[PDB]
Amino acid sequence: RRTRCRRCRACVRTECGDCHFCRDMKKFGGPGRMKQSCLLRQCTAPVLPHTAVCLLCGEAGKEDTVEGEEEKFGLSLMECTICNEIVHPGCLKMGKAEGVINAEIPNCWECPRCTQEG
DNA sequence: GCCAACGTTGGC
DNA sequence: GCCAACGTTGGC
Ligand SMILES: [Zn+2]
Ligand SMILES: [Zn+2]
Ligand SMILES: [Zn+2]
Ligand SMILES: [Zn+2]
């Protein structure tokens, strides 16, 4: 389950109080049953939750411990759009096999195992 | 514990 | 085929 980034112009904009979802909020005098965010606050690049860890080694992102961009990528968590697996690419045992990175979402790709199947 | 809100589905 | 409603997760 992804969480809003809290840093995009969408995230930092206040609730309009006039859209369909704001109108449902108790704070704006609604029943509070829809439980959805303001329609003007839809995060552009949602992030993995703080507690996300690699399926294989059980650790979180360690990309700050490495300098090079390839090394950093391998120590970062990547979530597969297809199999939903969150893993460090360096924790995978597929040599040359490359996935397909999604640039619209952070830590998002179609993993090397799925691209090969597909 | 409070509260915001993601992802999915049955009922229309 | 849509969407209100809900269970339940995530940040604080
Ligand atoms: Zn709104
Ligand atoms: Zn955002
Ligand atoms: Zn790992
Ligand atoms: Zn996959």
Distance A82 CA to B8 C1' (A): 17
* CA distance linking residue A37 with residue A45, whole number of Å: 15
User: What are the boundaries of each domain within chain A?
Assistant: 1-4+46-118, 5-45
* Cα A63 from chain centre: 16
Please tell me the experimental approach by which this structure was elucidated: X-ray
Contacts with A9 (C-beta within 8 Å, 6 or more apart), sequence order: A44
Bases along strand C below 7 A from a protein CB: 4-12
DSSP type of residue A14: P
Nearest to A87 by CA among A103, A67, A110: A110
A108: annotated binding-site residue? no
Nearest to A52 by CA among A118, A112, A111, A106: A106
DSSP type of residue A85: -
CATH class of A1-4+46-118: alpha beta
The bridge status of strand A100-101 relative to strand A108-110 is: antiparallel
Position A47, amino acid:
V
Structure tokens at A96: 């040359």
Give the burial class of A40: count Cβ atoms within 10 A of its Cβ; 0-12 exposed, 13-18 middle, 19 or more buried.
middle
> Using the CA of A4, which nucleotide's C1' is the nearest one?
B5
* CA distance linking residue A33 with residue A84, whole number of Å: 28
Backbone angles phi, psi at A109, to 5 degrees: -165, 175
The bridge status of strand A108-110 relative to strand A78-80 is: parallel
